[PDB]
Short mmCIF file of C-alpha atoms and ligand atoms in Angstrom, two decimals:
data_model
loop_
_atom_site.label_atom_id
_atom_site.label_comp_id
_atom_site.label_asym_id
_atom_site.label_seq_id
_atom_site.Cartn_x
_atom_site.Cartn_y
_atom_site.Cartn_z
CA UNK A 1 -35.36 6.71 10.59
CA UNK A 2 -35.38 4.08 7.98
CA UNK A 3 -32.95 1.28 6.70
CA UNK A 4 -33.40 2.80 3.84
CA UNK A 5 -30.84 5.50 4.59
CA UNK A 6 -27.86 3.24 5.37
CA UNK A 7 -24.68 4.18 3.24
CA UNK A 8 -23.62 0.51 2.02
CA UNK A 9 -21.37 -1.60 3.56
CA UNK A 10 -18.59 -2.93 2.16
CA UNK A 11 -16.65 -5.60 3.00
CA UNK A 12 -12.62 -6.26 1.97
CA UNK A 13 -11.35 -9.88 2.81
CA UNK A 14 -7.45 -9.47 2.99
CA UNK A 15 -4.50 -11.78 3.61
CA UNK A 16 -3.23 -12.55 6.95
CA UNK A 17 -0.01 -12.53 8.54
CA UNK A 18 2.00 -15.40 7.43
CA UNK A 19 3.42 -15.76 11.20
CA UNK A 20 0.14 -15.54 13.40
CA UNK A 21 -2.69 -15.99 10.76
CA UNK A 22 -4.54 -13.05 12.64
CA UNK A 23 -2.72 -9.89 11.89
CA UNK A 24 -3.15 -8.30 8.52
CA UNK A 25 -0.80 -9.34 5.63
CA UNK A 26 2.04 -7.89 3.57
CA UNK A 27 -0.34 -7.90 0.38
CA UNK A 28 0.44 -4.56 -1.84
CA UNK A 29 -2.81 -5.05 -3.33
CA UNK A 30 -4.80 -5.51 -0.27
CA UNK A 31 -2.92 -2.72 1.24
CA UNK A 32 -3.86 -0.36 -1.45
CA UNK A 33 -7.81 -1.27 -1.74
CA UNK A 34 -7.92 -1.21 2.05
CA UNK A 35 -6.88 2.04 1.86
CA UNK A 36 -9.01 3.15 -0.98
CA UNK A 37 -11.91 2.18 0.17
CA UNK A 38 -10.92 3.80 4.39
CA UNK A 39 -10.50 6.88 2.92
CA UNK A 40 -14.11 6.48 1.28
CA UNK A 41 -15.43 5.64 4.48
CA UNK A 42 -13.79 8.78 5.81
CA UNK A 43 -15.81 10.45 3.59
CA UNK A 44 -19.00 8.73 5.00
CA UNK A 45 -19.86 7.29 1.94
CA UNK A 46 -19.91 3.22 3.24
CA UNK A 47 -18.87 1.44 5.60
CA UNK A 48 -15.61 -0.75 5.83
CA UNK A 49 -15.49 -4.19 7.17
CA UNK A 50 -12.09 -5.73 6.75
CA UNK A 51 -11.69 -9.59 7.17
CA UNK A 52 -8.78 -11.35 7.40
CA UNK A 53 -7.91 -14.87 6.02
CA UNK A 54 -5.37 -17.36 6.60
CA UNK A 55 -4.72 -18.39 3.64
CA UNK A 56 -3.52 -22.16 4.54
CA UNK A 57 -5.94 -22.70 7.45
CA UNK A 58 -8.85 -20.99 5.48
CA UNK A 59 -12.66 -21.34 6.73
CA UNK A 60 -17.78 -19.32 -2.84
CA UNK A 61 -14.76 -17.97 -4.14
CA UNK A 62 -12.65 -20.99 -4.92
CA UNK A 63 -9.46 -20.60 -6.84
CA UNK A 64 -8.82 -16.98 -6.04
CA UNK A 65 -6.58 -15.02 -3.98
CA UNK A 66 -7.44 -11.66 -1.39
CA UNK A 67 -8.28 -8.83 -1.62
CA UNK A 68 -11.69 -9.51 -2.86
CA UNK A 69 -14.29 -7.45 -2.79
CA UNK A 70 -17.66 -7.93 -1.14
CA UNK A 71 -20.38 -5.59 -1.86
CA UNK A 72 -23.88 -6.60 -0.89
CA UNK A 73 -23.51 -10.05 -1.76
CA UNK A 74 -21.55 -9.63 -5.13
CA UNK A 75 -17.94 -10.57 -4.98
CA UNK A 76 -15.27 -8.75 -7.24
CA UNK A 77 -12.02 -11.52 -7.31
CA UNK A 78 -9.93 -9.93 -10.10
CA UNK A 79 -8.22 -7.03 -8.81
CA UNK A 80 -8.31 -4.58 -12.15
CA UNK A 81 -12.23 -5.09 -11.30
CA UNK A 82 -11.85 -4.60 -7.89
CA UNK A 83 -10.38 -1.36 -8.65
CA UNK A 84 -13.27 -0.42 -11.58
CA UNK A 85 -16.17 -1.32 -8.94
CA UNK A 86 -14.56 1.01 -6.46
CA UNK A 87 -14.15 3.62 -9.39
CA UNK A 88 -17.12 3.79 -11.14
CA UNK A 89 -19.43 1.65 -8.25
CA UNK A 90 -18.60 3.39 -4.74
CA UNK A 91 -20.22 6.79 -3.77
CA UNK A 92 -16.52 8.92 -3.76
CA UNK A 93 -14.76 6.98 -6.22
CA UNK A 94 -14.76 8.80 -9.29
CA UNK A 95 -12.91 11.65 -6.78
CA UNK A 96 -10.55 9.47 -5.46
CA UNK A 97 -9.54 7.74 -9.13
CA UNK A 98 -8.34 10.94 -10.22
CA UNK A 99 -7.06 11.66 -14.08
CA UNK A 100 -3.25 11.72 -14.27
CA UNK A 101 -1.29 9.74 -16.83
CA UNK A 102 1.84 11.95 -15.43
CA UNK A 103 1.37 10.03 -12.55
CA UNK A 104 0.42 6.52 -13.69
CA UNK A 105 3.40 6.57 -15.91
CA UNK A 106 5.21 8.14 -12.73
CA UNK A 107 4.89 5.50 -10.47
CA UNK A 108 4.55 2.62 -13.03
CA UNK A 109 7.21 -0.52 -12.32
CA UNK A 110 8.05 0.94 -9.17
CA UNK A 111 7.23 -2.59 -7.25
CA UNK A 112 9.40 -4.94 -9.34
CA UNK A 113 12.43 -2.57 -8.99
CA UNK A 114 12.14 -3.27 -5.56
CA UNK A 115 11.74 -6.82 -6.15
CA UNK A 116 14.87 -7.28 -8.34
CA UNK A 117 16.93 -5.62 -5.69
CA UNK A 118 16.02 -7.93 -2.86
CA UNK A 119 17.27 -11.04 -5.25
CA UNK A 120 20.78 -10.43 -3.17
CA UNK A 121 22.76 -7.11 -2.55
CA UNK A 122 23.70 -5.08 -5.97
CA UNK A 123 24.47 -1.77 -5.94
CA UNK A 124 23.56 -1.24 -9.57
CA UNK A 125 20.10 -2.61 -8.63
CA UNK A 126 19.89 -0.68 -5.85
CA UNK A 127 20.64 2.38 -7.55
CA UNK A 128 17.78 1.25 -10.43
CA UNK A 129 15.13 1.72 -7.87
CA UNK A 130 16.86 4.99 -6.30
CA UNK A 131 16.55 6.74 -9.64
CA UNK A 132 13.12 5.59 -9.47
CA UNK A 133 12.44 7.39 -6.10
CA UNK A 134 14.56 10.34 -7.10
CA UNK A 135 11.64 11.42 -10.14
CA UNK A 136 9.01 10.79 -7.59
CA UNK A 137 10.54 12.80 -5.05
CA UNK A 138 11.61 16.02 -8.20
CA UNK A 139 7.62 15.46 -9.25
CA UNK A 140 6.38 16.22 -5.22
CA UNK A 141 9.13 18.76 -5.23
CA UNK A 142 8.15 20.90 -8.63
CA UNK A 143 4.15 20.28 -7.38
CA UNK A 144 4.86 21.32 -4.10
CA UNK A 145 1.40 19.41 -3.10
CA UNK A 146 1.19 17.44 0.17
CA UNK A 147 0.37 14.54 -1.56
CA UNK A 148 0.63 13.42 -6.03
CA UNK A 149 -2.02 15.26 -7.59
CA UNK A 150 -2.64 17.89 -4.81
CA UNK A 151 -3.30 18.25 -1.37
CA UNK A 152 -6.03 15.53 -1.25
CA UNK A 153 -5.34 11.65 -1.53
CA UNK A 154 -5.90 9.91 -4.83
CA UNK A 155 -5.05 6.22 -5.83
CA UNK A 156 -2.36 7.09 -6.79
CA UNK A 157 -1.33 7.60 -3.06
CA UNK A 158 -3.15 4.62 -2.19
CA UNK A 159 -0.70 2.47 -4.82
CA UNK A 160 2.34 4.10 -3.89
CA UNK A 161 2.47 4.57 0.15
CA UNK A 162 2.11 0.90 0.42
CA UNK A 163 5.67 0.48 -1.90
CA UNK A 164 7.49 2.88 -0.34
CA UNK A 165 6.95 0.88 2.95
CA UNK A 166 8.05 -2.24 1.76
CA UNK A 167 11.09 -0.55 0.37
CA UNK A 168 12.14 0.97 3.24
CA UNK A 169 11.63 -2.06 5.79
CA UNK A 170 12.54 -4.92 3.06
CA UNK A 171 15.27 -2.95 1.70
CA UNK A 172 16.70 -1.64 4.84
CA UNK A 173 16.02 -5.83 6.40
CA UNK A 174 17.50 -7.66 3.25
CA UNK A 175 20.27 -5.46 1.63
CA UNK A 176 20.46 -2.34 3.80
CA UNK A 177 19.17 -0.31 1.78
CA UNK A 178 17.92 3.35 2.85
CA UNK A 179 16.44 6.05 0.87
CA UNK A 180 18.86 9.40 0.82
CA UNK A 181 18.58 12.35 3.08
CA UNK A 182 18.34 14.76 0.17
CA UNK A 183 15.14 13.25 -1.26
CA UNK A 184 13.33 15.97 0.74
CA UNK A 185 9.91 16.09 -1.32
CA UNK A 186 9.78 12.38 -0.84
CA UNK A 187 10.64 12.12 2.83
CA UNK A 188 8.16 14.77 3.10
CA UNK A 189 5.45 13.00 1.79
CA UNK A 190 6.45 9.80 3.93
CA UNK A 191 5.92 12.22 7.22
CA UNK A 192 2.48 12.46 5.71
CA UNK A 193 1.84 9.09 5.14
CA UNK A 194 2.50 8.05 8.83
CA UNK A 195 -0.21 11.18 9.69
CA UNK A 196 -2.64 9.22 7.86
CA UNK A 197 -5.32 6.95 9.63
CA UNK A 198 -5.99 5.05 6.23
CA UNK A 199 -2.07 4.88 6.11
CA UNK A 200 -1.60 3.67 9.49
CA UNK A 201 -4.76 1.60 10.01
CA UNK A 202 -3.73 -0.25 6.93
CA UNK A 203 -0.32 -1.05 7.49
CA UNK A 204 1.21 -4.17 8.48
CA UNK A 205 3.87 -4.53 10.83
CA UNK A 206 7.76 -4.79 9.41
CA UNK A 207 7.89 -8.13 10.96
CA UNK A 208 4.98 -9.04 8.33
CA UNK A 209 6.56 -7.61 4.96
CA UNK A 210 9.97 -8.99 6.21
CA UNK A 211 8.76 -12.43 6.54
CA UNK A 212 6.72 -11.78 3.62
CA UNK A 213 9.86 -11.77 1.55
CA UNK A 214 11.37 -14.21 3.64
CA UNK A 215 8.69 -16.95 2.32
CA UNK A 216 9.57 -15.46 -1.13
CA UNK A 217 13.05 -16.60 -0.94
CA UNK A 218 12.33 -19.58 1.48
CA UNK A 219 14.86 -18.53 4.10
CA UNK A 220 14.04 -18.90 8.15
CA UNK A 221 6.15 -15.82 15.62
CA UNK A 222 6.82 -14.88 19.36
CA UNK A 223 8.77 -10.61 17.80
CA UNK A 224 5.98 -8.29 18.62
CA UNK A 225 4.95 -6.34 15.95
CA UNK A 226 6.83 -2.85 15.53
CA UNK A 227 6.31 -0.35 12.62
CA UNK A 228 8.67 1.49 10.80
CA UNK A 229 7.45 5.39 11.24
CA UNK A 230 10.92 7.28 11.39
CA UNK A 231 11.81 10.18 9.53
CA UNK A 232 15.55 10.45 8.84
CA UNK A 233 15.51 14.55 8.84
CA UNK A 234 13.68 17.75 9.80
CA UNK A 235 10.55 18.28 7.93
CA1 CA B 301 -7.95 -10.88 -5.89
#
């Protein structure tokens, strides 16, 4: 009928691939906001144009780093605000920034566990971050919810998927690390996330996070992309 009506589009510049400058990035943040703001799309609410920029061959925002937010012409740079705007700014996000402090505290730290491990193979750091996952998986367990705070995604979800991907193809890639059978809740909820179109659309191939890391440690384009999606045991 009228323009008028249009839900808003928004637009999320992300990082590309650091071997083919085309394919979306290993960015946790961008990750994470990508999927935030799919799910509100989902929901009708906007619409989702993702851009992707190589950051050393790039083409009004100067010194800053993706994701950034574009939403009818204003720009949010800084991620905490990034993550406000879509809160308190985007039709659906009050919903989707649920209130848990359980979880928050939960998942908290999570990333530079992961991190630390990676430095070079140490069982003691490995088994830092597996303690980690074992009180995320006994939380899923005693909720018995498909996903943190119920059977609906939150941002929590949306912060946490993303890690558990890197930690299974970095960790497995780097220091062979894999995440136990007997975390059932937790492989549980990975099954889910690979269901998930705002999971899957968003996630970049294990050649991308490994070479992610790779840069990261400054170790050394034609592997086509795979992704990680296995499940280790029955669901
Ligand atoms: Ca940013």
């Amino acid at each position: 009928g009228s323009s008028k009506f249009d839900v808003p589009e928004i637009e999320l510049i992300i990082k590309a691939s650091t071997i083919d400058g085309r394919r979306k990035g290993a960015c946790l943040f961008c990750q994470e906001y990508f999927m935030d703001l799919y799910l509100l799309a989902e929901l009708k609410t906007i619409s989702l144009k993702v851009t992707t920029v190589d950051m050393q061959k790039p083409p009004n925002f100067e010194a800053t780093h993706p994701p950034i937010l574009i939403d009818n012409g204003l720009a949010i740079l800084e991620n905490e605000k990034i993550e406000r705007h879509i809160m308190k700014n985007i039709p659906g996000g009050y919903n989707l920034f649920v209130q848990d402090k359980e979880v928050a505290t939960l998942i908290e730290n999570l990333y530079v566990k992961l991190k630390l491990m990676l430095v070079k193979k140490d069982e003691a750091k490995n088994n830092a971050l597996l303690s980690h996952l074992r009180k995320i998986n006994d939380h899923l367990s005693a909720r018995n919810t498909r996903f943190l705070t119920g059977d609906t995604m939150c941002c929590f979800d949306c912060e946490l998927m993303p890690r558990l991907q890197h930690i299974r193809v970095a960790g497995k890639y780097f220091v062979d690390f894999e995440i136990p059978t007997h975390l059932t809740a937790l492989w549980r909820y990975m099954y889910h996330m690979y269901q998930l179109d705002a999971f899957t659309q968003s996630c970049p191939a294990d050649q991308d996070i490994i070479n992610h890391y790779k840069l990261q440690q400054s170790l050394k384009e034609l592997e086509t992309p795979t992704f990680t999606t296995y499940i280790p045991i029955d669901i």
